[PDB]
Symmetry: C2
Subunit: 250 residues, 2 copies
């Protein structure tokens, strides 16, 4: 077995001040990372320029938390060509909070992911089941339907730019992290589906991250499973223990 | 008659590159404004820091195109405390495109406007009727219902921070500007409602802007009407003729 390159991604969500972000970024700068891992920080749109100016650790790239495909008459939104023009070419799409609060259905997410791939982004595409779907034994059907709705809009080559993040909705910000065994079963099920429907060569390379109440203590155990390639981290990524989350992908 | 201080507001919507924004801002900097008018520029979230760094004309303030009330687990969004912390204390709320595409009902807009007022923002609150409501002779009922839904969440003192922008939906970006007579009838109807329901002292001071295909040629005629206090400008605010829009409020 050899895993692909791991990703440790910080989703700051709608949080931060200039003061608190300058301290955290200094913490990240001074942490020396000695293994091959892609680190990702996703600040709010307004903080992108501050983080670009301060972040110096060569293992990091900056991501946006959302975008729309095209520039134009969309008051309030930020487009993919605008992010590219300021030097951001990662984006998180179809996070649970957007699917729930802000009306992003599978079709909308799939369209965004496809456009992002056409425009050269690296995409972190989020999927996952609610507690009601999990109790109804629908987990597999839900995550596979969300995944093939995205697959439907993509070409084989575009899977090089795609990272999947499985985040059970009941684990996000609740403190109730999935067990390593729960997460591994889903990750294995996804990798298999990709290997059968897209290609074995695509499946071998695909990073599939776990997210939902990851912290510095439980990270190392989740990362020991064979189909977990790293993490999407909310709450714990606003703290200095994000360093030991990164170091748990060694 | 004496009008309140006029406002000329540029809503760039989801447009701009670093290069095109640096040129435009230079144009605005070099235009000397010799009368009392509050100018407002509303770039995308990502461009706020670039515009703060370059914009030097003392008649301008920077606005956000949207916000949510509170920081927290809202991937993709930007909150009112975050904007205040970077020195932005104007916001446009309940623009047509948000009400239409992104599910902002009257209650959601009213909650945002109320929170923004509590947090000390100057708010540009947008209302207006569609072409179907206008043909059904519902204009007055629609704009008054949108306005009293906001009024319901406010206290009398909070009206000092509120600017209303009437923008018929059929005039936005279409090229089909309302006539000075159409706009004046609505603006008069709104001022009267405020004078009766909130206070005559509030109504005298309230800025009510017109928006919807304003350009440098038609601005001066709209501004000659007694209840029009300036403009919210989309398409024409991305061009150097925004200078003569500003100068039409003399």
């Amino acid at each position: 077995s050899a895993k692909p390159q791991p990703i440790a991604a910080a989703n700051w969500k709608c949080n931060g001040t200039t003061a608190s972000i300058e301290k955290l970024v200094q913490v990240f700068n001074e942490h020396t990372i000695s293994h091959d891992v892609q680190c990702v920080v996703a600040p709010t749109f307004v903080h992108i320029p501050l983080v670009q100016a301060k972040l110096r650790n060569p293992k990091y790239v900056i991501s946006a938390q959302n975008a729309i495909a095209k520039s134009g008459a969309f008051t309030g939104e930020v487009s993919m060509p605008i992010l590219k023009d300021i030097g951001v070419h990662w984006v998180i799409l179809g996070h649970s909070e957007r699917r729930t609060y802000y009306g992003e259905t599978d079709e909308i997410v799939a369209q965004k992911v496809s456009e992002a791939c056409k425009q050269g982004f690296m995409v972190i595409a989020c999927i996952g089941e609610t507690l009601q779907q999990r109790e109804a034994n629908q987990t597999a059907k839900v995550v596979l339907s969300q995944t093939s709705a995205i697959a439907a809009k993509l070409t084989k080559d575009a899977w090089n730019q795609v990272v999947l993040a499985y985040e059970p909705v009941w684990a996000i910000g609740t403190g109730k992290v999935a067990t390593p065994e729960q997460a591994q079963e889903v990750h294995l099920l996804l990798r298999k589906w990709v290997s059968e429907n897209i290609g074995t060569d695509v499946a071998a390379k695909l990073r599939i991250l776990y997210g939902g109440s990851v912290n510095a203590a439980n990270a190392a155990t989740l990362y020991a499973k064979p189909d977990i390639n790293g993490f999407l981290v909310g709450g714990a990524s606003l703290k200095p223990e994000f360093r030991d989350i990164i170091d748990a992908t060694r």
